[PDB]
Structure 1
Amino acid sequence: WMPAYACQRPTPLTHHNTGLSEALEILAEAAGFEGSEGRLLTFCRAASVLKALPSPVTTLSQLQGLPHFGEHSSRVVQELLEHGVCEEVERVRRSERYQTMKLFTQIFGVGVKTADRWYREGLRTLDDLREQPQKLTQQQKAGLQHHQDLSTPVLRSDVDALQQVVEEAVGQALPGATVTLTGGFRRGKLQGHDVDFLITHPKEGQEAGLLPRVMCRLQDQGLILYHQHDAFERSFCIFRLPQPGSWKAVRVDLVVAPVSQFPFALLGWTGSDLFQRELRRFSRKEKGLWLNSHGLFDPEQKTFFQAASEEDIFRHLGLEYLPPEQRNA
């Protein structure tokens, strides 16, 4: 009994079907590059089902009945099991379009629509973009400037150092405010593309205006290479992280939430991306409730659920609780 929504089953970080899931994820990414979010989602959901299975799939038979496996995903698996390669996957992954779209969308500040326009204009390399700086937003200029460092995996030692400097700035900005590591590192990942932190204060309302004060204190300590900055509560930053004898750029996301919303923000920002999309879809389509990073809303009674923990949210949705390390959908 494989449940159909990813939020209904545990997905560990280490799983048993990486060859098959990787192939489906290439097809998902290619679907996104061609503007089909629906096909992207199906291929991601199928890949995720494989990550939740207890053992390796060795025979096509083992897919029977699994949700999100239809004719196309099944054929991909069948070719991989019988030949060790899937022609369609190889054609996609070796194509100029796929490789260029992947290169460009991996830049901070560049998504599919921007990458597709550049591709249609004949651009193919990072050097091509550097030569045409007037095509770039300031966010994209920062992403390109720091691209090599941003392609280096962030490690747990980096997380620990960043948490210390963020806690220092937060404490200087508002006594009693707290910093919680979220994102993939909270799910047990050993590396990441960035570090995500959620900031609050135990007294509702005290955190208003906090994030500009934090950003100013980090900027004055020379720690900020790029940020968007009158009020704001999320910052998608690039930090200058000291290293032995030098420094490296690291993407850091900072989000401030009132404490009433903390469990919802913690749940949302802990991910994974697919886990949260599936949880929000489940909430609305199966329970008639609207979930976001601020709350859980009953649109008929026009009321918000008062959760004290992530556990409370799962319970109000009729779901078995999953700890962060089982949300790796």
Structure 2
Amino acid sequence: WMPAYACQRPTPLTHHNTGLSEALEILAEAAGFEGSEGRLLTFCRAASVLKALPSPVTTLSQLQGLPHFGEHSSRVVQELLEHGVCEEVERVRRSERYQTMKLFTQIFGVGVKTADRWYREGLRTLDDLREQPQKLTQQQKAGLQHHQDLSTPVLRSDVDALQQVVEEAVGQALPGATVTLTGGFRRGKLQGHDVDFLITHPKEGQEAGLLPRVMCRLQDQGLILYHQHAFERSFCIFRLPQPGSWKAVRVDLVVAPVSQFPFALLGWTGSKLFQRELRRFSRKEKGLWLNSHGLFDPEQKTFFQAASEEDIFRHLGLEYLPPEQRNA
């Protein structure tokens, strides 16, 4: 009744088990902070199963036969159903380790490994990091400077304004080039913490060298507060107008040749768990190797040509899911 892979089932953005899924996702996050990628995956998958259910779980027996619910995830749900709270989840929430690792890893430029090292050095607050700035990368300095703005959600109205300024720069850099909104906003989210755009051109090869030309033009317009600088992905901080002022916003720009555009669109539309599950399914169930550039048959040694996302789902034997149902 419930398939084992997230790419085999629709997952809407809003659902009927929000509290249960949130709790499991705390444990997934905490597992990641400790480097337990396997446990993170299981808790992520179990949470996603609940998002895909058609009604609320009210009794423990409703978990029977659901994939990725074993002793541990079932106990979490059982405690939430019985008491409205799971002691393990609450212990994680208030732990100094969890709170500090969450604070540090949310900094642009800081991953689990860096945050863990700082935690082991005794560091706990953003101001702790500010007081020792020689130990920071330029990327981390920017993440810390802009951390407050970057913690504030971006609205869809903001996204539309950003897309227009990106299109202007892209049109000068390469007439005919197109800009597509991807990521969480393409899946229907009304807010987000970053904006994702995918850029291509209908004439194969014309997109070569495009991203530097786009970045130089955005920078000349005074819109780039931070970027790394040939390349095809740019992780930027943009200056976004606001009433009488402005705010910093994370924007990612990606270029792909049109032959690869369906694969890049699929990959950059997510969710992250949906894409991991889709690539796992492709390799393990179909023997095909999927990434954001293409889909490879290692037996024939050939790449599948796709003209659409629909093509890719068909080539994997999966029912098509629109972006709004990929919220795994």
TM-score by length of 1: 0.99
Deviates more, 1:131-140 or 1:260-269: 131-140
Runs of 4+ in 1 over 2 A off after TM superposition: none
Deviates more, 1:134-143 or 1:190-199: 134-143
Distance, in Å, in 1 between the alignment partners of 2:96 and 2:283 is 39
Distance, in Å, in 2 between the alignment partners of 1:232 and 1:243 is 30
Deviations 1:233-292 (A, max 9, x none): 000000011222111000000000000000000000000000000000000000000000
Partner residue in 1 for 2:223: 223
Deviations 1:106-129 (A, max 9, x none): 111111101000000000000000
Deviations 1:49-86 (A, max 9, x none): 00000000000000000000000000000000011111
Deviates more, 1:128-137 or 1:214-223: 128-137
Partner residue in 2 for 1:108: 108
Deviations 1:116-164 (A, max 9, x none): 0000000000000011111211111111110000001000111010000
Partner residue in 2 for 1:328: 327
Structure 1, unaligned runs of 5 or more:
none
TM-score by length of 2: 0.99
Distance, in Å, in 2 between the alignment partners of 1:49 and 1:290 is 24
Q: How many residues align?
A: 328
Distance, in Å, in 2 between the alignment partners of 1:13 and 1:246 is 32
1:185 deviates by 0.4
Deviations 1:286-306 (A, max 9, x none): 000000000000011110000
Deviations 1:187-211 (A, max 9, x none): 0000011000000000000000000
Distance, in Å, in 2 between the alignment partners of 1:35 and 1:173 is 42
Distance, in Å, in 1 between the alignment partners of 2:172 and 2:242 is 23
Deviations 1:10-65 (A, max 9, x none): 00011000111111000000100111000000000000000000000000000000
The CA RMSD over aligned residues, in Å, is 0.5
Distance, in Å, in 2 between the alignment partners of 1:244 and 1:100 is 33
Deviations 1:170-193 (A, max 9, x none): 000001000000000000000011
Distance, in Å, in 2 between the alignment partners of 1:161 and 1:141 is 27
Distance, in Å, in 2 between the alignment partners of 1:176 and 1:18 is 43
Partner residue in 2 for 1:299: 298
Structure 2, unaligned runs of 5 or more:
none
Deviations 1:84-118 (A, max 9, x none): 11111111111000000000011111111010000
Aligned-pair identity (%)? 100
Partner residue in 2 for 1:131: 131
Deviations 1:217-244 (A, max 9, x none): 0000000000010x00000000011222
1:235 partner SS? strand
1:214 deviates by 0.2
Distance, in Å, in 2 between the alignment partners of 1:88 and 1:121 is 26
1:241 partner SS? strand
Distance, in Å, in 2 between the alignment partners of 1:176 and 1:244 is 32
Partner residue in 2 for 1:275: 274
Mapping for residues 69-218 of structure 1, pairs under 5 Å: 69-218=69-218
Partner residue in 1 for 2:283: 284
1:2 partner SS? coil
Distance, in Å, in 2 between the alignment partners of 1:153 and 1:134 is 30
Distance, in Å, in 1 between the alignment partners of 2:241 and 2:91 is 42
